[PDB]
Amino acid sequence: LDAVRKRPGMYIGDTDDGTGLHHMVFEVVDNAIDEALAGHCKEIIVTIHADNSVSVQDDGRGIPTGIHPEEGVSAAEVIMTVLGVGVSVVNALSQKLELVIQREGKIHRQIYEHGVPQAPLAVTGETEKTGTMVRFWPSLETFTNVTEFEYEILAKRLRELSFLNSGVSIRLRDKRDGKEDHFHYEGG
Amino acid sequence: LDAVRKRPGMYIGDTDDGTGLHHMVFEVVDNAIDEALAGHCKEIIVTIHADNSVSVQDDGRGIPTGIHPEEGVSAAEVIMTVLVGVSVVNALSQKLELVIQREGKIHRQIYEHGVPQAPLAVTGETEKTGTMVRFWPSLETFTNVTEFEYEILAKRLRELSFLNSGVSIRLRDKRDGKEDHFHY
Numbered sequence: 001l002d003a004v005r006k007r008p009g010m011y012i013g014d015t016d017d018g019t020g021l022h023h024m025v026f027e028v029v030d031n032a033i034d035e036a037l038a039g040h041c042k043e044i045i046v047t048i049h050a051d052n053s054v055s056v057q058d059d060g061r062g063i064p065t066g067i068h069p070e071e072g073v074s075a076a077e078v079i080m081t082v083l084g085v086g087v088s089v090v091n092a093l094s095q096k097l098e099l100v101i102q103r104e105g106k107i108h109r110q111i112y113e114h115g116v117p118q119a120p121l122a123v124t125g126e127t128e129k130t131g132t133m134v135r136f137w138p139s140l141e142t143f144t145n146v147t148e149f150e151y152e153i154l155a156k157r158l159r160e161l162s163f164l165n166s167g168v169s170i171r172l173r174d175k176r177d178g179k180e181d182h183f184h185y186e187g188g
Numbered sequence: 189l190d191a192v193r194k195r196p197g198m199y200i201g202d203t204d205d206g207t208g209l210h211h212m213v214f215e216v217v218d219n220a221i222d223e224a225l226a227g228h229c230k231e232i233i234v235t236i237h238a239d240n241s242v243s244v245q246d247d248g249r250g251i252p253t254g255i256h257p258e259e260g261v262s263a264a265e266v267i268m269t270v271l272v273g274v275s276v277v278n279a280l281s282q283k284l285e286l287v288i289q290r291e292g293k294i295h296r297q298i299y300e301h302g303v304p305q306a307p308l309a310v311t312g313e314t315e316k317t318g319t320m321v322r323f324w325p326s327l328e329t330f331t332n333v334t335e336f337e338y339e340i341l342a343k344r345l346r347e348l349s350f351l352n353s354g355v356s357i358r359l360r361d362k363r364d365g366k367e368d369h370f371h372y
């Protein structure tokens with residue numbers, strides 16, 4: 001990840017005007033949609049939290065959790081720490097990132113700070129559901145000037161995406177003012 | 189450097205009891221001595237600053253500044269960013285200032301958590317030669333014991349002065365004005 005940290009603008013875009021900031025959300029959304037479109041009648045939920053973090057949930061299969069034979073860490077950690085631009089770029093430029101994977105009847109949790117895992121991916125409990133949740137806090141050391149998520153930039157993009165992803169339910173939630181949208185195109 | 193950031197304790201030592209914190213200084217000093225023991229009447233100055241940073245100055249030849257043919261960046265940057273070594277210290281420092289005097293030129297570079305902020309750059313002229321590294325330990329890594337104890341540094345630098353007989357070692361505390369000069 002040091003290549004991304006050295007020149008953030010090359011990977012995410014302009015880190016001052018707010019375009020790069022919103023590309024962080026859209027990069028995570030692209031991966032969640034990729035997963036959701038591969039399943040049956042899946043759903044993604046994008047939530048803007050009151051602390052200006054954004055979470056993206058899907059109810060797909062979950063990011064693989066088994067140990068990568070070569071790397072010697074969970075497949076999820078390899079995806080988060082090895083260099084669409086990739087979710088690893090979002091991880092590298094986030095001061096905090098929370099990963100929650102529900103898979104094979106088990107809840108897996110891991111926390112990152114500036115791309116560095118604070119502990120190995122850990123099975124913390126049990127679940128009947130499946131899916132992946134990524135919540136990230138953009139790094140205020142990288143993202144300057146424009147540091148808050150505009151609802152309409154996310155809402156407009158998710159509406160456009162809905163028509164290219166048939167059968168995928170897309171929900172947007174703003175916990176700052178309670179505003180919410182539901183985009184669900186069922187064509188084809 | 190992510191391997192170091194992931195498990196700081198395995199590279200520098202215990203990051204809670206003050207052991208690792210002081211090892212950060214000793215790692216930089218090892219390189220400075222190494223350098224300086226390849227020459228003759230060299231001196232190393234270790235300074236504890238009021239803002240809880242430590243600087244190590246030497247009057248050696250200076251770390252090589254030219255572009256590394258394989259890596260495509262300055263040889264100094266390769267030393268600070270590739271794998272114990274000063275790269276470990278760089279990785280676990282929230283800020284690190286590098287100043288190299290070599291071949292008639294002063295070179296400067298700043299790092300934050302091991303990430304270079306710009307390329308090694310010529311900032312002026314000089315008759316002198318040497319290397320200076322000033323680092324601010326990351327308080328995200330180093331907990332409980334965050335401030336440098338003078339006597340922990342003094343003890344180790346004394347031991348080093350006997351082993352490295354030709355090298356002068358000065359220790360300076362800018363918080364309370366305390367100082368020592370170890371030379372065998």
Ligand SMILES: Nc1nc2ccccc2[nH]1
Pocket residue numbers: 005113114116141193300301303328
């Ligand atoms: N605050 C902060 N910024 C960082 C950048 C890279 C790795 C660790 C870091 N901690």
Ligand SMILES: Oc1ccccc1Cl
Pocket residue numbers: 028031032035056058060063087132133134
């Ligand atoms: O399904 C997910 C969700 C977020 C990031 C990456 C993946 Cl694969």
Ligand SMILES: Oc1ccccc1Cl
Pocket residue numbers: 216219220221223224244245246248251274319320321
């Ligand atoms: O002489 C040197 C060399 C490497 C790191 C620090 C110093 Cl002071």
